[PDB]
Amino acid sequence: GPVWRKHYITYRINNYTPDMNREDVDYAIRKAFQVWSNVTPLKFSKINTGMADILVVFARGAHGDDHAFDGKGGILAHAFGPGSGIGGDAHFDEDEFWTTHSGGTNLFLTAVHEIGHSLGLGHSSDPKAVMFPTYKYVDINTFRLSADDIRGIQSLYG
Ligand SMILES: COc1ccc(S(=O)(=O)N[C@H](CO)C(=O)N=O)cc1
Ligand SMILES: [Ca+2]
Ligand SMILES: [Ca+2]
Ligand SMILES: [Ca+2]
Numbered sequence: 763g764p765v766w767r768k769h770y771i772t773y774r775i776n777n778y779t780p781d782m783n784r785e786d787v788d789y790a791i792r793k794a795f796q797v798w799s800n801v802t803p804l805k806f807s808k809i810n811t812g813m814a815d816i817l818v819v820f821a822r823g824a825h826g827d828d829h830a831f832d833g834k835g836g837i838l839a840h841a842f843g844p845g846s847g848i849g850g851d852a853h854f855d856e857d858e859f860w861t862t863h864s865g866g867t868n869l870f871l872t873a874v875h876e877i878g879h880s881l882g883l884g885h886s887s888d889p890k891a892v893m894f895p896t897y898k899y900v901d902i903n904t905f906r907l908s909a910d911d912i913r914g915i916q917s918l919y920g
């Protein structure tokens with residue numbers, strides 16, 4: 763489907779979850795973008811004002827799209843593929859408890875997956891892939907994309 767047709771991509775953090783330290787949200791999101799810039803020609807920059815390609819939002823329940831959140835558990839996050847407006851945006855359910863670690867729901871791991879969607883990836887049927895639709899914590903310090911994830915993204919970029 764749709765892909766970004768340019769190499770310099772911007773993101774903006776709309777608002778911050780109270781679940782985490784501000785600096786930890788910034789770093790988790792930055793690291794998640796880095797996972798994908800590692801394996802593509804894309805470059806990501808955080809902007810603090812204006813219209814970004816990818817808007818990162820924390821919200822609960824109904825939040826202005828057709829995809830209301832469902833309280834704690836179930837749907838953790840969702841995102842929209844490349845395009846104008848809502849295209850590229852990544853939304854995280856504030857009814858989850860976001861963390862830097864194995865507790866609650868890990869923001870970095872979830873963001874890697876969601877940014878995958880923001881870049882145009884769909885779901886994998888392979889449980890080993892970060893793009894598998896089910897959340898399962900893995901050690902974030904040693905995290906690596908699966909072969910399936912790399913094949914997927916390199917079918918779109920580079
Ligand atoms: C590892 O990243 C994620 C991100 C979200 C989810 S999820 O919310 O439980 N499942 C949703 C619904 O299909 C999903 O894939 N959202 O992008 C599961 C794992
Ligand atoms: Ca939820
Ligand atoms: Ca957008
Ligand atoms: Ca929360």
Ligand SMILES: [Zn+2]
Binds near residue numbers: 825829840853
């Ligand atoms: Zn949404």
Ligand SMILES: [Zn+2]
Binds near residue numbers: 840875879885895
């Ligand atoms: Zn998904």
